[PDB]
Design an enzyme around this catalytic site. Structure first.
Site, PDB file in Angstrom:
ATOM      1  N   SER A 169      63.443 -18.650 -26.543  1.00  0.00           N
ATOM      2  CA  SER A 169      63.071 -17.297 -26.926  1.00  0.00           C
ATOM      3  C   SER A 169      62.587 -17.255 -28.373  1.00  0.00           C
ATOM      4  O   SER A 169      63.111 -17.958 -29.242  1.00  0.00           O
ATOM      5  CB  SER A 169      64.276 -16.373 -26.756  1.00  0.00           C
ATOM      6  N   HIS A 203      65.042  -9.666 -31.321  1.00  0.00           N
ATOM      7  CA  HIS A 203      66.357  -9.518 -30.711  1.00  0.00           C
ATOM      8  C   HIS A 203      67.277 -10.701 -30.973  1.00  0.00           C
ATOM      9  O   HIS A 203      68.443 -10.654 -30.565  1.00  0.00           O
ATOM     10  CB  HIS A 203      66.230  -9.295 -29.205  1.00  0.00           C
ATOM     11  N   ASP A 230      59.000  -6.625 -29.893  1.00  0.00           N
ATOM     12  CA  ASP A 230      60.047  -7.616 -30.128  1.00  0.00           C
ATOM     13  C   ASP A 230      59.483  -8.766 -30.963  1.00  0.00           C
ATOM     14  O   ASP A 230      59.334  -9.901 -30.513  1.00  0.00           O
ATOM     15  CB  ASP A 230      60.625  -8.093 -28.801  1.00  0.00           C
TER      16      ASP A 230
END
Ligand SMILES: *[C@@H]1O[C@H](CO)[C@@H](O[C@@H]2O[C@H](CO)[C@@H](O[C@@H]3O[C@H](CO)[C@@H](O)[C@H](O[C@H]4O[C@H](CO)[C@@H](O)[C@H](O)[C@@H]4O)[C@@H]3O)[C@H](O)[C@H]2NC(C)=O)[C@H](O)[C@H]1NC(C)=O
Ligand SMILES: *[C@@H]1O[C@H](CO)[C@@H](O[C@@H]2O[C@H](CO)[C@@H](O[C@@H]3O[C@H](CO)[C@@H](O)[C@H](O)[C@@H]3O)[C@H](O)[C@H]2NC(C)=O)[C@H](O)[C@H]1NC(C)=O
Ligand SMILES: *[C@@H]1O[C@H](CO)[C@@H](O)[C@H](O)[C@H]1NC(C)=O
EC number: 3.4.21.47
Lengths: 48, 48, 712, 48
Positions: C646, C473, C523
């Site tokens: 992330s 993402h 992801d």
């Protein structure tokens, strides 16, 4: 002495628990008269 | 106290009972000598 | 004179005369052991030594009796079946735990021809301790039911059996027991020639790839006692020649020390020479040695030999040396354990560990800087004395017992046919220049510039020379390769990429029909770089699940399946892990707990409080089985992941090695606001990750040409 | 260990002293005998 079972040959009882047989069983056997029968082979502990 | 039970109906037993040696304990049983006595137990009785 | 051979034969076997007729060794067939005595000494009275047991009972005649595997006299938290007074060869017993317990180790074990049970030790564990359950090896007895921190357990074998390994183990910080797992050996179990060289190289390569920079010393001690023989020395000379070339086949040239001893120590090659690091020069010295002087001084003074090894490594008021806290020492010795001169040799071993600063601290044990390997040459072997001299490191063997010498020469030509998959991943050696990117070499910093949307600050993990694993993402289909710049190793420049490989199942907007704006299933993404990465001190990869190098990094047998590795790294408990975060332009580690046991349910149901997910009906629709859960209040207050952390790795630190098991995905509560960390976090602030064991067929395909060696 | 009195010199004395369990062989001289409650003290000055 020379007669009797030799003391080293005797294997002593050792397993003396207070509670056991804590297992889950699912009655997946074919149901006759609405009743399912599971045969379990269990091993008994050394307690008297 | 090690209690020996004799639940036979009409047979008296001649038993040689021995205590095994452990280095964590200090008794009369050593490494080069056994602590064994022979007793007679009457039927339907016990001996301490 | 020589003893008379009358009344000394055995029922069902023969014998052979060793030590010029001064000792007989009984030769029973395969599957039998000689009753009590393996050998007999020739006392100088005309008669041999009496057939004394371990209980010192006088047996009149000897007889070859059958070999039994040791019976399990103690087993907790379950039921094993069947129970027998003794177990013959090729018998099988199975293990099965109670409700609410996870079985790790081999569930089905088989007694082999060498008197040992196959597979790994079965352990029923509930996952309530800081350390795991050390379990009960078959034949032992464990004293200590508490498995908390700073706790200890003691082990005892049965009657007439010799303990190999650590008698006492202690739970250390990090979730790893001290010492090694015990195993009850007998007077006849020995070791197969395959099992000797299999375990010896898996210990030796660990203390070689950390030396990788010239900074390693190897000490060689050989026993020349009269209880071995003149014919058994020259066969041990040719064995030691094969050892030096295997060590030099790794590109590392250590310093060697050759000392042969008996009554006195004789130093042939000292480590403080200018030619000791030349591996070919020490091999020339090994043929020039002669054992005629050690045969005159027939004796076994082990203590005076180790005092010469102490004098080689000690410094005479030199005042801390440059390699005092950076030099790996390996001590290799062969003996029979029957020492009678000088005294207890263990007192010299404790002086060596004190000189190397081992055990004198609680935060830094330094156990990887001294390894001691003891090999047993003959049937005349005291297994107690050889076990107390050797080191006891976790999941590893250092004591060996073999017979007839020639089979020990067979293990040295076999080990050079065995190739060890060297793994440079997860290696962090303590260099005194502790700036960041030295403690975390694998950490990638990814920057994506978008047209007026801002800069996307994500992270990733170096998995190979060309690929960087991260989340999916961070990028979209509109982001081009010239607008994505990745930086590793703390370098000011940006590296250019070739392609971003998304997983084929990723779809962030695939639940907008159901009212769910975000959907972080699968992801993960790979970043193929344009330039090859050169491995050094600040850039190194991180190991991945179900590979050849991961199998040796956990000290497992090479027959370990991928399902067996998933039982090892992610068990059904609360698993200690860590991730990498950026605190004020400086990288730091945050230790978390992976809720994979009974707290997995309480962790996953807290996803309803996430933004956009406030009206989601079924909570399992947004949390697939491809997810792991960290953070919360029970059992501890875990630090939460930020938006800038992330795509980073979810790492598990086990035995001074770092294995990545997940990729950071998303979180429910944003506790980081780029001002500090919000010091009042809520209790349901959980963070979710992508389980790497579930994306394995996609990772195996995209990295098939990378020499990683994925399992079948 | 035993009463012995068998002698036999080194054939029954060197082989017992050169067993791997034997640590020390000394020749001493008794100086003072001190009776003291739990353990008895024998002070031996080492000659060789
Ligand atoms: C090899 O051995 C030597 C000798 O033991 C060893 O030297 C030590 O080096 C470390 C640094 O690597 C020293 O640690 C620091 O020393 C400074 C003074 O020089 C202190 O002020 C420091 O205290 C502060 O800093 C810490 C963080 O850096 C804080 O956590 C702390 O609370 C303080 O704010 C710190 O102690 C250490 O003092 C010396 N020791 C000696 C005896 O000289 C060397 O590091 C060893 N090599 C390796 C690779 O380990
Ligand atoms: C470890 O070994 C045991 C055998 O020693 C394996 O047990 C096998 O388990 C299967 C279940 O998938 C059994 O099948 C079932 O057997 C029952 C018998 O009552 C039958 O009623 C069912 O219809 C079904 O066929 C199988 O019988 C059993 N094997 C034996 C020899 O009994 C076990 O799977 C092994 N586990 C591991 C982890 O290796
Ligand atoms: C093992 O072998 C012995 C040898 O006679 C036999 O008596 C016994 O029944 C066998 N099986 C078990 C379970 O002990």
């Amino acid at each position: 002495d020379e007669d009797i079972i030799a003391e080293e040959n005797i294997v002593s009882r050792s397993e003396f628990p207070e509670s056991w047989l804590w297992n889950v069983e699912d009655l997946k056997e074919p149901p006759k008269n609405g009743i399912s029968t599971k045969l379990m082979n269990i091993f008994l502990k050394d307690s008297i | 106290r090690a209690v020996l039970y004799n639940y036979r109906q009409n047979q008296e037993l001649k038993v040689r009972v021995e205590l095994l040696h452990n280095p964590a304990f200090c008794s009369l049983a050593t490494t080069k000598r056994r602590h064994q006595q022979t007793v007679t137990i009457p039927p339907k009785s016990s001996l301490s | 004179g020589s003893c008379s051979l009358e009344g000394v034969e055995i029922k069902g076997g023969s014998f052979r005369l060793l030590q010029e007729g001064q000792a007989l060794e009984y030769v029973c067939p395969s599957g039998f052991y000689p009753y009590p005595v393996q050998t007999r000494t020739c006392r100088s009275t005309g008669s041999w030594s009496t057939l004394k047991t371990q209980d010192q009972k006088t047996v009149r005649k000897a007889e070859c009796r059958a070999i039994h595997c040791p019976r399990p006299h103690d087993f907790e938290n379950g039921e094993y079946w069947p129970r027998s007074p003794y177990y013959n060869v090729s018998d099988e017993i199975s293990f099965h735990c109670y409700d609410g317990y996870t079985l790790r180790g081999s569930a089905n074990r088989t007694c082999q021809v060498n008197g040992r049970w196959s597979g790994q030790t079965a352990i029923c564990d509930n996952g309530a301790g800081y350390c795991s359950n050390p379990g009960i090896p078959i034949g032992t007895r464990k004293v200590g039911s508490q498995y908390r921190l700073e706790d200890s357990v003691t082990y005892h074998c049965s009657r007439g059996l010799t303990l190999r390994g650590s008698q006492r183990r202690t739970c250390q910080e990090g979730g790893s027991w001290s010492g090694t797992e015990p195993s009850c050996q007998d007077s006849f179990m020995y070791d197969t020639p395959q099992e000797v060289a299999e375990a010896f190289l898996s210990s030796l390569t660990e203390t070689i790839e950390g030396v990788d920079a010239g900074s390693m010393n190897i000490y060689l001690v050989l026993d020349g006692s009269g209880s071995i023989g003149a014919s058994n020395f020259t066969g041990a000379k040719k064995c030691l020649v094969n050892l030096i070339e295997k060590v030099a086949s790794y590109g590392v040239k250590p310093r060697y020390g050759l000392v042969t001893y008996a009554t006195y120590p004789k130093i042939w090659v000292k480590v403080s020479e200018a030619d000791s690091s030349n591996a070919d020069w020490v091999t020339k010295q090994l043929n020039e040695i002669n054992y005629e002087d050690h045969k005159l001084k027939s004796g076994t003074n082990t203590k005076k030999a180790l005092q010469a090894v102490y004098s080689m490594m000690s410094w005479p008021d030199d005042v801390p040396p440059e390699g005092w806290n950076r030099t790996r020492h390996v001590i290799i010795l062969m003996t029979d354990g029957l020492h009678n001169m000088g005294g207890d040799p263990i007192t010299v071993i404790d002086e060596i560990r004190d000189l190397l600063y081992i055990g004198k601290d609680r935060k830094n044990p330094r156990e990887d800087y001294l390894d001691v390997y003891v090999f047993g040459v003959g049937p005349l072997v005291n297994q107690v004395n050889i076990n107390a001299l050797a080191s006891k490191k976790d999941n590893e063997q250092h004591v060996f017992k073999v017979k007839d010498m020639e089979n020990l020469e067979d293990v040295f030509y076999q080990m050079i046919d065995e190739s060890q998959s060297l793994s440079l991943c997860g290696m962090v050696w303590e260099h005194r220049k502790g700036t960041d990117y030295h403690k975390q070499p694998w950490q990638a910093k990814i920057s994506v510039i978008r047209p007026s949307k801002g800069h996307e600050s994500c992270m990733g993990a170096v998995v190979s020379e060309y690929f960087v694993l991260t989340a999916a993402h961070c990028f979209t289909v509109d982001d081009k390769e010239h607008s994505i710049k990745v930086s590793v190793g703390g370098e000011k420049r940006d590296l250019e990429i070739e392609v971003v490989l998304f997983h084929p199942n990723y779809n962030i907007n695939g639940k907008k029909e159901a009212g769910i704006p975000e959907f972080y299933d699968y992801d993960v993404a790979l970043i193929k770089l344009k330039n090859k990465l050169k491995y050094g001190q600040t850039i190194r990869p991180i190991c991945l699940p179900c590979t050849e190098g991961t199998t040796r990094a956990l000290r497992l047998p090479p027959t370990t399946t991928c399902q067996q590795q998933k039982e090892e790294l992610l068990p059904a408990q609360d698993i200690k892990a860590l991730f990498v975060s950026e605190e004020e332009k400086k990288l730091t580690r945050k230790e978390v707990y992976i809720k994979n046991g009974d707290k997995k349910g309480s962790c996953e149901r807290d996803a309803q409080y996430a933004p956009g997910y406030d009206k989601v009906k079924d909570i399992s629709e947004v949390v697939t089985p491809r997810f792991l859960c960290t953070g919360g209040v029970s059992p501890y207050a875990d630090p939460n992941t930020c938006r800038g952390d992330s795509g980073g790795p979810l790492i598990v630190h086990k035995r001074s090695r770092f294995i990545q098991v997940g990729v950071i995905s998303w979180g429910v509560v944003d506790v980081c606001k780029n001002q500090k960390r919000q010091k009042q976090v809520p209790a349901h602030a959980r963070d979710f990750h992508i389980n790497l064991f579930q994306v394995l067929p996609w990772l195996k395909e995209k990295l098939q040409d990378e020499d990683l060696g994925f399992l079948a | 260990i035993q009463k012995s009195d068998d002698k036999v010199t080194l054939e029954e004395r060197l082989d017992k002293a050169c067993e791997p369990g034997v640590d020390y062989v000394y020749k001493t001289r008794l100086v003072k005998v001190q009776l003291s409650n739990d353990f008895d003290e024998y002070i031996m000055a080492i000659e060789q």
